Design a protein around this nucleic acid. Structure first.
Lengths: 895, 89, 96, 98, 92, 97, 85, 106, 96
DNA sequence: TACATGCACAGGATGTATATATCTGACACGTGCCTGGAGACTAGGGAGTAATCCCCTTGGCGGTTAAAACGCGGGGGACAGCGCGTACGTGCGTTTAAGCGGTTGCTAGAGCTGTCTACGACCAATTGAGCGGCCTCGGCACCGGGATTCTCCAGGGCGG
DNA sequence: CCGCCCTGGAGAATCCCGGTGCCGAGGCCGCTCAATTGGTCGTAGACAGCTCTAGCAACCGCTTAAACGCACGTACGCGCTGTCCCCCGCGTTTTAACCGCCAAGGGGATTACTCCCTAGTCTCCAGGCACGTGTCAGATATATACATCCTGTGCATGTA
């Protein structure tokens, strides 16, 4: 640590610190946020005349009123203002930008007679879509937290942190609880259940090194409130439960349309409501499927606390602050409040630190072919997770080679199998067929595959038809010059030598599709066939004739149009789709187009415009790999594979956009191949893969605990329980679920309860003999000071109220009516304590119990949020007074 | 309309955006910048690159290669009095 | 934390003279490099470090040229650099 | 006899045998004297130590325990003579002097 | 097997700053630096031998090339370092 | 009497000295300067006459090429008179000092 | 061992500096230019003569030759044609 | 026999001397047979390039001998010879006549 | 004793001059400048070819290194006419 | 005489800082090998030294005249101040594309091992090309006398 | 009647033509060293085969900050004006650079001879690279003792 070498050079010392401060250069709102919609009249319409022309900006200012979303509000506070009403404030430029396009420009196009009626109706439909979306923001979706804030001299109204339907957690706002219960009481109810819940990660049975023997069953379990669970769906749950009991990890590999999401939701329901494994579970899905997952948990398991973890940095911070742990502010280690977490692949990589440091109990990865590569970032990030059991959901466990399946297995079973060999159909020795038999036998207990034909037989069959069409003259010229690297002929008509021969396979496929994919080919043709063909219909000849595939395609289109068929044309290159979209434009056919540049908003517009009953569209141009697995074009009938793929599953998925559950015609497929080109090397290499997948898959502390010993804390817990619920013999498993009583057998609790009431009855007997001598506490198992008289009288009080409400207003505890005779009022409290307040108090002690006054105060279902002032003007009522008032009102009811 | 024509794309020299040129002027300590500077700067950079690449490609063709490596660039920079440290290994 | 008017340029000079990152975006610069190389030979490949070395060198060159341009502007009693300042700095260096 | 390195005989850390081999194979002359690699390795080690001392001081002034290219740039451009020796040189990821 | 000066640069660092590390990019810069000054000195000594009709590069050539290439005070201290090392190597 | 206007004789001299090639500094004063500078490096040095002539050719080429850059810097500032700050700017941009 | 020379930078007279400025194309000259240019010339000459005397001492000579000056110039990037080499 | 390699290449510059200078300048361990021929052809081309322009400049001044002034005029008036010799001083060469337009009388 | 011989390019420069301008002469000083020019260009080309052979780990200087060095050092059209001159000379030499 | 709200007080439940067992990542220790550096010995040329020659560098002198030094009037250009107008920076809302992660098959190129031949080094004998010495007579420099080209200022004419 | 602009001429400077005479450019010659020829020999580099990784083309998706378009205000650049400082043009005096000649001698170049230092070759081993593993201090979660604090019950005055 002492330097043994210095410089004798006499240079001046330097300060190398480059940290600076900008302090020497020194000396949450309420403005327009969004403009939803406008109105024809700012106040009153003095005349509908002069509808011609388009209004000016000043005219719009003096003629309309707008619905304004305000910053720091919550859409429920949207008001109708005018340019004059609000006047001057932030965000005024947003209002001007609204007037510029939705009023001025929009009316301009509607005045031009060059616009067809079909375009006018499209704009009308679009405006309808915009406002229909803006309606969903009023509906609350989930209540996150509740605080008793104190308004400006407004006592302490209750505020609900509400998240809205189509918004994230950076848009969640506080709202007055009295209005929330009027808007959506079902979500208030769900927040109540989620508040004091039995299903909690801290109270799960730790099945370690020994798991209960699962029994294959044939009854849809009662905790599955969704609907009618299919037979092939019930089979999967038993499969997964068996694999879990043994301690194994499987793969759900059904085909699309069999509901693989329902089966895994119902399995989590089983894993919680049966084996009491309700810890933190994680489900990783693609973004496009996240809606369909969420509502499934909302329908087939409405009691589970499932949260969605996605959004911007602020929105993801809100979730961690309010919905992760039971108590976040505590400095010590925090617990977990949720049961199921739903995230996407993007945030597994962003927040791997905040998510990997959690003891998960079950991981489920949807679309697990995304994990077919063991060197990807998602793979190395999901393996570092500390999870017990795992499951993968994929309709294609193997796609190209056998290394993909090996990586999936090593994700599930890190070390069990050892798939370190690749099948080759060239050697075909007896040992290789043995290898196929070996793997096909070893993985069978871990893959559950079913087909759309083996079940759900109502499905029209699909037939594939390969068509080999030879090249043309321009195609043969280009294929020849590229195959020989003859730069000169390829660059004779080029703009800067743009002809690049890096990746020759790519150029041979561009030539085998259409010569116009190369630059200046349009100049060579047309000019060298019909020089002077600058007019249309003659250019169309250049398109259709310069390609061998264009000929067969044009013939097919003319033939198919007259028959009652619709066409889906798939291609690998989107530039070939531009060429096709020009041939169809000059011809005059109506088509749709979906590729990787079309934003998600326009995609669903296109899909519905194609599936409308009065649809003038004939064909749909589709990129082969775009869109994902959610596109549904079952109205079309014919599928034309223009370009093939190295992966056969990528083309099968393109066929499944018309051959799915719901298809009612015979789907016809047309492959277009160019003979004696590299295209034939693709199909052949694809076929091998199609055979491999049919050969491997498609063949079928510091102190110890105890058991049931009752201690001092156990007696104090049972004493406070006899100070609240009292008769808990029929409610023993409930209090043991939420953690009130320690982990003890219900038998010992019942025994101690009989002993408690007997020691109290003997106490009151001794007190009776000790009160008439000259004319109340008793210790139990160490706990001193236990009121016997008050406890037994309270037991009789609660039992009286139970047999007065469990049979009278059972199916409606809120709808309750006291007797016509009214007891005398209170001793002048700070609130208008009438008879309805007494009835609501009677229901509150029934639902939340005695002593728990903070629970009774915080419940808008009663209506006494601001009528009770236990703690934060010193008010008259209190915790002792409400209890004495119940013992006075109930004694008035008994007689 | 016209979809097969792969044109209407910005030039590659224009990918050196005006904010990027302004950041480079800020690291040089410049306070105000004229509006005509941005087309001037693009012309200067384009000349500079053309002199370095022409040399690197020469070094690449002599070695009978098709790949321009980092050493080709280091040598091309060195032979015009602009030695660069940090890539020569 | 309200800054004075007229101090945005000074704060940016202090910010960018402290950091060391590259100030041009990588993808556009790489497209430019390949377009220029196209005029000397067709079908060239690039190591990724060759493009990184080109970018380091080209940005060092431009920053050092903006320093001389700034001196030429202060010589003419201005604070705004103009194209004539770049031309003077490049002619005195011996490039024009 | 047991072999002692030529760098330890001169009290050096830089490798004298490798510098000799690089002189013999760089086409610098027909012959290389015996003291030429020793002298040259001593000068290379001296200049390395001069730069590393200033660069470690710069890393310490910025509360760091590891030299990065920025610290080499600061050390070189602040020293008048080192700045003269490396005047036509660009250090990658080095920055400028504020 | 790239053969660089990394381990010798590290030995010198542990003499000037025992409790300091160095990153990998900085080590590559130091490697480029030692190669650059090697080439400059050896080239200048080569030209000195050609000018004088000599066949050998000796310590005298290295001393004169150091006096021509280093500025001012650096050259004085580098000359004394080299001289001290040759004297120690000989008397041994 | 007759007088040429200021700047006329200066342009005439620019044309005269841009046609000739002879040295513009006197030889004997320059030789004394060379020897005085050298005596601060080694004493009792001798010089070949062609060595002093080579030093003078190089010195005059250097100074003429520096005055060209200084004139550009003076015109840049919208002056016609060269000043010391023009020499300083030109030398700073060249990379000298 | 000869005598001592002193104050020889003043032998670079103002007329000679004006002629050098006229060959550079300069039309008007400030009065502060003369001492400035004397300083610039003295720095240039110190660098070249230092390198040339180094070359002379390495050859163990006592006379500075024209090749010494030509090498000293070449190594500073100022090649001179017409004096040998 | 006795035939120079210069006459076999059709050159005026000495191929054997260039070969000797390559083998004695410490440029590599070996020297190929066509490297002297190539290098001598290039040096001859460049010499003829500059001498043509210098003789033209000598004719413009009504002279029959080339002096350093004519080599300087030749080099600084040709755009590519000026770039090859950008950092070279030609002794007794002078400069090119060039006055800035701002200095001319109006 | 004996005045040592001194090699120059003067006679070859004179032959080339008589090919280009049969009636023009040259002075002693201009001939010295031409000799310096030839030696300077030789040193440049040969040094760049030496470096090229080192970068590629070769032990020989061939006409390919001379051609590549000529392309690196000469600018523009000078380089094209020089490589054609050199290639023509090597072709005439080899076919003899 | 008896029931009910107001008040003071006692005492354990929950919050907090601290010592302690646990996990972890960089640091230091041990292995191997193998390749390049070190030790040893020899031949032969390159480098060092002494003696000599002769040239070219330094020093002095004396006259001459070109160039520098210096003084002075005055013209013009440097410079400071002022006013205007427009281009540049700032803010704010909206679009766009960069960055990152991913696919699929093919090829370039580095690194390794191994074979083989043409080419370049090396050498001895020869010979002619190029260099140093000598000589001379033409291109070029200098001088002189006109011819002409250019600068500048004052006066007359002409327009406002 | 006034202001400005064109021109005419006077003088200084530059160009041009002829004459002279000089001293270096270019040719000739003898010789002597380096280029050429012819032969041998070893290894550099070209070619082959094989494995492993990056680069490429043309697509896909998602997030987010950067790029961009526009409105607008004011800070700066630029133009004009006046003053006065200082540089130029020119004449008169002073000084020292230059030229030509001469002499001394210092040192660089040449030659002969010697010896020691480096390349070449060969044997042998450990220094440096790649790899794996034991170890210790720092970060961290947790049990624990201590401490502050909200809370619930028995006594008391007031009303029926």
């Amino acid at each position: 640590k002492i330097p043994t070498r210095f410089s004798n050079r006499q240079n001046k010392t330097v300060n190398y610190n480059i940290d600076y401060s900008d302090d020497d250069l020194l000396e949450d709102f309420h403005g327009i946020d969004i403009v939803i919609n406008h109105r024809l009249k700012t106040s009153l319409e003095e005349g509908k005349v002069l509808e011609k022309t388009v209004p000016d900006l000043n005219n719009c200012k003096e003629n309309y009123e707008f619905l304004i979303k305000w910053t720091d509000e919550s859409h429920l506070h949207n008001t109708w203002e005018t340019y004059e009403s609000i006047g001057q404030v932030r965000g005024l430029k947003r209002l001007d930008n609204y007037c510029k396009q939705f009023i001025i420009e929009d009316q301009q196009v509607r005045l031009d007679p060059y616009v067809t009626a079909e375009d006018i109706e499209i704009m009308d439909m679009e405006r309808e879509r915009r406002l229909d979306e803006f309606e969903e923001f009023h509906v609350p979706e989930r209540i996150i937290d509740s605080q008793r804030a104190s308004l400006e001299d407004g006592t302490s109204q209750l505020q609900y942190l509400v998240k809205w339907r189509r918004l994230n957690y950076d848009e969640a706002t506080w709202e007055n609880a009295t209005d929330i219960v009027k808007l959506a009481p079902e979500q208030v109810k769900h927040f109540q259940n989620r508040e004091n819940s039995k299903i909690l990660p801290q109270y799960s049975s730790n099945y370690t090194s020994q798991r209960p023997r699962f029994e294959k069953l044939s009854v849809q379990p009662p905790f599955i409130k969704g609907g009618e669970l299919r037979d092939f769906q019930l089979t999967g749950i038993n499969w997964m439960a068996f694999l879990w009991s043994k301690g194994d990890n499987g793969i759900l590999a059904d085909e699309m349309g069999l509901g693989k999401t329902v089966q895994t939701v119902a399995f989590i329901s089983w894993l919680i409501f049966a084996r009491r494994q309700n810890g933190p579970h994680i489900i990783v899905v693609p973004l496009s499927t996240m809606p369909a997952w969420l509502d499934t948990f909302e329908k087939w398991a409405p009691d589970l606390n499932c949260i969605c973890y996605m959004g911007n940095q602020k929105s993801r911070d809100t979730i961690r602050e309010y919905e992760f742990y039971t108590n976040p502010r505590a400095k010590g280690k925090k617990t977990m409040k949720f049961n199921v977490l739903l995230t996407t692949y993007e945030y597994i990589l962003k927040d791997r630190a905040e998510l990997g440091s959690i003891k998960w109990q079950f991981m489920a990865v949807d679309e697990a072919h995304r994990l077919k590569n063991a060197e990807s970032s998602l793979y190395e990030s999901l393996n570092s997770f500390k999870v017990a059991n795992r499951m993968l959901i994929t309709g294609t466990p193997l796609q190209n080679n056998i290394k993909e399946l090996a990586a999936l297995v090593n994700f599930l079973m890190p070390g069990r199998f050892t798939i370190d060999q690749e099948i080759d159909f060239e050697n075909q020795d007896e040992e290789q067929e043995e290898y196929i038999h070996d793997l096909h036998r070893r993985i069978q207990p871990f893959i559950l595959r079913r087909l759309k034909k083996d079940v759900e037989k109502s499905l029209p069959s699909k037939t594939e038809r390969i068509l080999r069409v030879e090249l043309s003259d321009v195609q043969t010229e280009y294929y020849k010059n590229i195959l020989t690297k003859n730069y000169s002929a390829l660059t004779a008509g080029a703009k800067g030598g743009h002809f690049s021969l890096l990746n020759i396979m790519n150029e041979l496929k561009k030539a085998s599709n259409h010569p116009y994919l190369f630059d200046n080919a349009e100049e060579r043709v047309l000019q060298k066939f019909g020089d002077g063909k600058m007019t249309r219909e003659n250019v169309l000849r250049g398109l259709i004739m310069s390609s061998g595939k264009m000929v067969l395609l044009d013939q097919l289109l003319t033939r198919l149009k007259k028959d009652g068929h619709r066409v889906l044309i798939f291609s690998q290159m989107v530039r070939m789709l531009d060429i096709l979209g020009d041939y169809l434009s000059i011809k005059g056919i109506n088509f749709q187009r979906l590729d990787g540049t079309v934003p998600s908003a326009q995609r669903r517009i296109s899909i519905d415009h194609f599936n409308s009953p009065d649809s003038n569209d004939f064909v749909f141009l589709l990129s082969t790999r775009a869109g994902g697995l959610g596109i549904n074009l079952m109205t079309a009938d014919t599928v034309v594979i223009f370009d093939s793929d190295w992966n056969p599953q990528a083309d099968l998925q393109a066929m499944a956009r018309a051959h799915r559950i719901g298809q009612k015609n015979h789907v016809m497929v047309y492959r277009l191949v160019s003979k004696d080109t590299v295209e034939e090397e693709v199909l052949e290499r694809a076929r091998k893969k199609m055979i491999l997948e049919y050969a491997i898959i498609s063949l079928g502390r510091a102190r110890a605990n105890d058991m049931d010993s009752i201690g001092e804390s156990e007696v104090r817990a049972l004493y406070k329980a006899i100070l609240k619920f009292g008769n808990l013999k029929e409610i023993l498993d409930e209090l043991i679920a939420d953690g009130t009583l320690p982990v003890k057998s219900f038998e010992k609790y019942g025994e101690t309860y009989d002993e408690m009431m007997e020691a109290a009855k003997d106490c009151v007997h001794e007190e009776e003999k000790n009160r008439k001598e000259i004319l109340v506490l008793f210790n139990f198992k160490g706990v001193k000071s236990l009121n016997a008289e008050s406890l037994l009288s309270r037991v009789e009080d609660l039992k009286y109220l139970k047999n007065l409400i469990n049979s009278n207003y059972k199916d409606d505890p809120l709808k309750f009516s006291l007797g016509n005779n009214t007891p005398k009022p209170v001793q002048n409290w700070s609130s208008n304590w009438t008879k309805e307040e007494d009835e609501k108090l009677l229901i509150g002690v029934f639902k939340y119990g005695y002593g728990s006054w903070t629970q009774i105060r915080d419940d808008p279902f009663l209506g006494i949020t601001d009528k009770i002032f236990l703690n934060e003007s010193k008010k008259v009522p209190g915790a002792i007074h409400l209890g004495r008032r119940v013992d006075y009102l109930l004694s008035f009811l008994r007689g | 309309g016209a979809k097969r024509h792969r044109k209407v794309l910005r030039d590659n020299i224009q990918g050196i955006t005006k904010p990027a040129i302004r950041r480079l002027a800020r690291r040089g300590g410049v306070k105000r910048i004229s509006g005509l500077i941005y087309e001037e700067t693009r012309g200067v950079l384009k000349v500079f690159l053309e002199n370095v690449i022409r040399d690197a490609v020469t070094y690449t063709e002599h070695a009978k290669r098709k790949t321009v490596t980092a050493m080709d660039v280091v040598y091309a920079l060195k032979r015009q009095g602009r030695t660069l440290y940090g890539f020569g290994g | 934390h309200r800054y004075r008017p007229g101090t945005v340029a000074l704060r940016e000079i202090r910010r960018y003279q402290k950091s060391t990152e590259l100030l041009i975006r990588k993808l556009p610069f790489q497209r430019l490099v390949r377009e220029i190389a196209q005029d000397f030979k067709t079908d060239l490949r690039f190591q990724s470090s060759a493009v990184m070395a080109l970018q380091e060198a080209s940005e060092a060159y431009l920053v050092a040229l903006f320093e001389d341009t700034n001196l030429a502007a202060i010589h003419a009693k201005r604070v705004t650099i103009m194209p004539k300042d770049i031309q003077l700095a490049r002619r005195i260096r011996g490039e024009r | 006899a047991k072999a002692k390195t030529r760098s330890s005989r001169a009290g050096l850390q830089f490798p004298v045998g490798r510098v000799h081999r690089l002189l013999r194979k760089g086409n610098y002359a027909e012959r290389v004297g015996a003291g030429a690699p020793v002298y040259l390795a001593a000068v290379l080690e001296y200049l390395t130590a001069e730069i590393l001392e200033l660069a470690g001081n710069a890393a310490r002034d910025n509360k760091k325990t590891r030299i990065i290219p920025r610290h080499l740039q600061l050390a070189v451009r602040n020293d008048e003579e080192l700045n003269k020796l490396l005047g036509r040189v660009t250090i990658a990821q080095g920055g400028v002097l504020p | 097997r790239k053969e660089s000066y990394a381990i010798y640069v590290y030995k010198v660092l542990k003499q000037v700053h025992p409790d300091t590390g160095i990153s990998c990019k900085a080590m590559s810069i130091m490697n480029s630096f030692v190669n650059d000054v090697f080439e400059r000195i050896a080239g200048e000594a080569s030209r000195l031998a050609h000018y004088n009709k000599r066949s050998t590069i000796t310590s005298r050539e290295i001393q004169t090339a150091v006096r021509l290439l280093l500025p001012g005070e650096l050259a004085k201290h580098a000359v004394s370092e080299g001289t001290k090392a040759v004297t120690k190597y000989t008397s041994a």
